[PDB]
């Protein structure tokens, strides 16, 4: 099995309820087990700012699924939690499940790019990741602890 790390976000339809429901759904993904759940953080919106604050979190999920198979399940869960596509880039959503990392794999398919392209620039991804995996090393050898020591990210507040 491989340890995948999934970023969770919600800013619509009661984010705490959406995230708790998503965690239960993540538990039902086949060939997979949740290892660790982060704290929940209240985060200002990235992109357009005319939307509610997000609940952001992270989960470690060990799995024997193929990377795109895991994506099939995360997309399914988003859709089943009423996620509807709107035109607005980075606009509000009931649930976002991004695959941040899939072990040490570097994946570039039509549907999937891992590591997540912007995660090293987002405190709302890196802080919950550090909470659950403080010893993490990226596929390029960069240490999570070193990024968080060196780069300025705003303080992240718990939900
Ligand atoms: N690592 C990854 N995790 C989840 N989806 C990914 C992905 N890499 C590529 N994708 C693709 O990204 C597509 C669009 O997803 P969106 O949720 O609309 C982007 P977003 O999460 O709002 O922005 P962001 O990636 O800047 O955080 C999905 O349909 C999926 O095919
Ligand atoms: N804080 C935050 N802002 C966003 N804008 C679009 N998606 C997001 C998520 S998931 N979190
Ligand atoms: Ca399972
Ligand atoms: Ca996202
Ligand atoms: Ca997404």
UniProtKB/Swiss-Prot annotation:
Assembly behavior: Monomer.
Listed name of the protein: 2-amino-4-hydroxy-6-hydroxymethyldihydropteridine pyrophosphokinase
Gene3D superfamilies named in the record: 7,8-Dihydro-6-hydroxymethylpterin-pyrophosphokinase HPPK
Temperature impact on function: Thermostable. Retains 75% of its activity after heating 30 minutes at 96 degrees Celsius.
Catalysed reaction, written as an equation: 6-hydroxymethyl-7,8-dihydropterin + ATP = (7,8-dihydropterin-6-yl)methyl diphosphate + AMP + H(+)
GO terms of molecular function: 2-amino-4-hydroxy-6-hydroxymethyldihydropteridine diphosphokinase activity; ATP binding; kinase activity; magnesium ion binding
Summary of the function given for this chain in its UniProt record: Catalyzes the transfer of pyrophosphate from adenosine triphosphate (ATP) to 6-hydroxymethyl-7,8-dihydropterin, an enzymatic step in folate biosynthesis pathway.
Protein EC: 2.7.6.3
Entry's family note: Belongs to the HPPK family.
GO biological process: folic acid biosynthetic process; tetrahydrofolate biosynthetic process
Source domain of life: Bacteria
Higher taxonomy: Bacteria, Pseudomonadati, Pseudomonadota, Gammaproteobacteria, Enterobacterales
Pfam families hit by this protein: HPPK (PF01288)
């Amino acid at each position: 099995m491989t340890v995948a790390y999934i970023a969770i976000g919600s800013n619509l339809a009661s984010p705490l309820e959406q995230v708790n429901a998503a965690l239960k759904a993540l538990g039902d993904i086949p060939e997979s087990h949740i290892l660790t759940v982060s704290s929940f953080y209240r985060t200002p919106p990235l992109g357009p700012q005319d939307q509610p604050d997000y609940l952001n979190a992270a989960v470690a999920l060990e799995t024997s699924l193929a990377p795109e198979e895991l994506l099939n399940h995360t997309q399914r869960i988003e859709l089943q939690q009423g996620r509807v596509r709107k035109a607005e880039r980075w606009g509000p959503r009931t649930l976002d499940l991004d695959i941040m990392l899939f072990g040490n794999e570097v994946i570039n398919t039509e549907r999937l790019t891992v590591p997540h392209y912007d995660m090293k620039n987002r405190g709302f991804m890196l802080w919950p990741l550090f909470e659950i995996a403080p010893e993490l090393v990226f596929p390029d050898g960069e240490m999570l602890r070193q990024i968080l020591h060196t780069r300025a990210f705003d303080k992240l507040n718990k939900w």
